[PDB]
Structures are given as C-alpha cells and as structure tokens.
C-alpha cells in the first residue's frame, strides 16, 4: 500500500467502487413503518455484502488480521452506507436516493417513528456536498478514510501510514484541480469536518435501528443483527 | 448511434455493463429460490443496461418491451457463461454462489442445462473470448432475438463492424476474422437453444409451485 503513487491510489479506489443497488420497492401499496423499514434494511443488507468486498480492495485493509478487519467494518458500516447515500443524493435536492427506484423526501421519512430527523441530517449533508461541489475522486478517498479511521481508537501505525497516504492523495487531487495552496488546506479541513457529522448521524441511525429491532418492527438478517450488536 | 466509431461503440458497451450481484451466503426449493432471486434482481439491472445499448431507446416502448421479453434469459445465460470462463467445471452464478456440475442434480432436469452452460463456458475459454467481444455479443442478442417476431439491422451491422474491428486490431488475418466472427455467432444459436430449454424448465417449476417475482412471472408468461 505505501508504495502507491497518488494517481494509483485514486485509480485503485475508483476501480473498487461497488455498484448502486435497487430496492424491492413495491409501488402498488402505500408505505407503513414496517414496510419502509423492511425496504431500507433489505437494501442495507445487500449493500453490506458489496461493502465488505470493497473493503478488501482498499489499500492496506487485507494486511490486517481478520479480527481487525471485522472491527473496522463493525465500526464503520453505517457511516459508509450513509456517505454513499448522501453522495448518490447530491444531484437530487430535497430527496434521498436510497436506490434508483427508491427516491424519498423528508415527508416520506415521516412514516417511520424517529426517522425524519435522521433524514434531515442526511439531506443537509447532501446539500453541503453539493455546495462544495464534491468530486468522485474526493468521495472515494473520504469513504476509505472512514473505513480505516472510525474504529482505529477502539482497536495501528500501519493504518495511520495509509491514512497519511490518502491525505497526500486528497491534496494531490485539489492541486491538480487548480486550487491554491491555501484553498487546499481549507478544503481538506472542510471535508474532514463533515466526517464528524457523518459519525454523529451513524450514532443516531444506530440508536434508531436498535429501537426498531427492540420493538419487533422488522426482522433483521444475521449480519445486520451482529453489526448492530457490535455497538450495543 | 450509427455515427459512433468502433472504439466509441466498445467504450459505450463496456461502460454500460451491469454489476455482478451476490447470492445469500440444498434442496430443490432452496437452490431454485437462490437462482430465481438472483435472476430477478439481475433483471432490473439488465433493463438499465439495455437502455444504454446504442439504438435501443430509439425504439418504441412496445418494441423495447418485446426485445427484452425475448432476450432476457439468453442475456442472463451469456452473462453467467462469461463469469464462469475461468472456472472450468463450475458456474459462477455469484461470487459467493459457485456451483459445480453435480450440484445441478439437486434440481430436477437442471443438470442438462448446467451441462450446456458449462460447454459454452468451455467453448469461450478455448476461443479466448475477450471482454470487448463479449459485450458486442450480448448487444447482438438483445437486438437480434426478437427481431423476427431497418434501423435495428443497421445497428446490428455496426456491431458486426465493431467485432471485426476488434479482431483486426488483435492481428487476425482476413480469413481468421471471418472464421472467428462465424464461430462466435454460431454460439449464439446454442445460447438461444439453452434459453428455450431454460424457459420450459422455469415454467414447470412455476407449475409445481418456489415463489416467483411478478416481474419474473411476466417475463416467463410472454414466452407462453
């Protein structure tokens, strides 16, 4: 991993991007809390399988022990689902593109108890990315950072080395895009500060999902149950 | 559409490729469940892919529906056969559902379909089929399979031009280009045959009553 140039980092990360999946949205019926939570968790579960295989292609990730890989994914999975959603949703103001056949506004978020506030945070994040004109190369870098960073103080110098490499790569992209040196560190800060909000949203979403489970609203796959359980 | 260069046609087709999807992580009702669930999810991605096959959205909605109804299992199958090329003796339905020939026996009447698919895979391997050739073949299947039930034939000619261009670029002689073109198109005949057999197998499964999606059901139904 530490030998990759900036452009090779970018290319590897672009090559590794998972597909955009479809939901099982059934438009014959209006939403209920249960059917909407069913759709969203069914989608999350299938995305998780692709995320896990993506993770194995992020430089330095498969160098780690299986325990450490498990730990990072358990810490980061909902942050990663969310930043993807927010990226997908950038060119759809006021809506969340959970899937190409599942585009939702905050009003629809209301059919699930406690969901609308999480929708609002996700929407505002999407607006922030739009107003920053976030680029795809920047986005894949951020998502990788989330993967390697979110669990690192709950566990390595190897991960920090890779994280530093991704920082070099972000600056490289910005320089290449013609940003002044000052603009480069300002934008680097702006992107990284958004990760704090994504962490926050993930914590809310995790508390939300847990309550749904604890009220028997939806059945969850064993994978989702265990992801949730890792967080208490 | 007909104005694109061969390289631009290839670029366009490569860019339009659907993703490889995963299975769940056997009885006859269990394996058929996995296979049909996978197929139904792939179908949704196939319909997106189709709209990016040059010339296809130019067609009326009726004609688009017809081609897809005719072609969909052929397209799933050539997809599977391509995925499985570098796995002699196995079918890579999904990266986490890699089935050997013997697992075909779990389901009544499937081992024969498995055998035909493996033979196609083996055939592609021997021909050393290239990805750029594969996406041309898949486009030909979409546009050709329902075309007897002028613009389409112009687009088909363009894809033939594209295939020949790839073989020319690879260093094949004139004689070798025509022979390889012929070899590849004759395989599509075998793929049509497999689709016919697969369609009857699926219909009889519906009759025994594994659940089928609404979409999968109407695709099935159009073949009466």
């Amino acid at each position: 991993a530490l030998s990759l140039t900036a452009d090779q980092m970018v290319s590897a990360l672009l090559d590794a991007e998972p597909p955009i999946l479809y939901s099982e949205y059934d438009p014959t019926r209006p939403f209920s809390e249960a059917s909407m939570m069913g759709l969203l968790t069914n989608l999350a579960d299938r995305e998780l399988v692709h995320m896990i295989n993506w993770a194995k292609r992020v430089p330095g990730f498969v160098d780690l022990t299986l325990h450490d890989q498990v730990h990072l994914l358990e810490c980061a999975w909902l942050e990663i689902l969310m930043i993807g959603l927010v990226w997908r949703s950038m060119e759809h103001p006021g809506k969340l593109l959970f899937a190409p056949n599942l585009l939702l506004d905050r009003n629809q978020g209301k059919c699930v108890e406690g969901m609308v506030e999480i929708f609002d945070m996700l929407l505002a994040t999407s607006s922030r990315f739009r107003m920053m004109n976030l680029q795809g190369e920047e986005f894949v870098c951020l998502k990788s950072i989330i993967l390697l960073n979110s669990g690192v103080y709950t566990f390595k110098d190897h991960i920090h080395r890779v994280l530093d490499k991704i920082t070099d790569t972000l600056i490289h992209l910005m320089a290449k895009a013609g940003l002044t040196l000052q603009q480069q560190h300002q934008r680097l800060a702006q992107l990284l500060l958004i990760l704090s909000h994504i962490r926050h949203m993930s914590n809310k979403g995790m508390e939300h999902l847990y309550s749904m489970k604890c009220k028997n609203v939806v059945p969850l796959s064993d994978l989702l149950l265990e992801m949730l359980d890792a967080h208490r | 559409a007909l104005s694109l260069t061969a390289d631009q046609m290839v670029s366009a087709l490569l860019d339009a490729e659907p993703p490889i999807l995963y299975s769940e992580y056997f009885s006859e009702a269990s394996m058929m469940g996995l296979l049909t669930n996978l197929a139904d999810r792939e179908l949704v991605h196939m319909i997106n892919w189709a709209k990016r096959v040059p010339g296809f959205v130019d067609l009326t909605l009726h004609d688009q529906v017809h081609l897809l109804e005719c072609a969909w299992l052929e397209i799933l199958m050539i997809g599977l056969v391509w995925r499985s090329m570098e796995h002699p003796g196995k079918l890579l339905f999904a990266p986490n559902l890699l089935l050997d020939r013997n697992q075909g026996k779990c389901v009544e009447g499937m081992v024969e379909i498995f055998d035909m698919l493996l033979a196609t895979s083996s055939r592609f391997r021997m021909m050393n089929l290239q990805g750029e050739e594969f996406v041309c073949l898949k486009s030909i299947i979409l546009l050709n399979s329902g075309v007897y039930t002028d613009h389409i034939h112009r687009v088909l000619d363009k894809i033939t031009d594209t295939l020949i261009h790839l073989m020319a670029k690879a260093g094949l002689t004139l004689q070798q280009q025509h022979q390889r073109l012929a070899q590849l198109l004759l395989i599509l005949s075998h793929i049509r045959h497999m689709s016919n057999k697969g369609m009857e197998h699926l219909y009889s499964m519906k009759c025994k009553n594994v659940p089928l999606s609404d979409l999968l059901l109407e695709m099935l139904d159009a073949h009466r």
Partner: peptide, 11 residues
C-alpha cells in the same frame, strides 16, 4: 465466531 469473520474469508 461472528458471521463476518467467516464471510470475510470467502472469495
């Protein structure tokens, strides 16, 4: 073990 632990080993 956790499901993930095994799943991670599948290629």
């Amino acid at each position: 073990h956790k499901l993930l632990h095994r799943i991670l080993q599948d290629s």
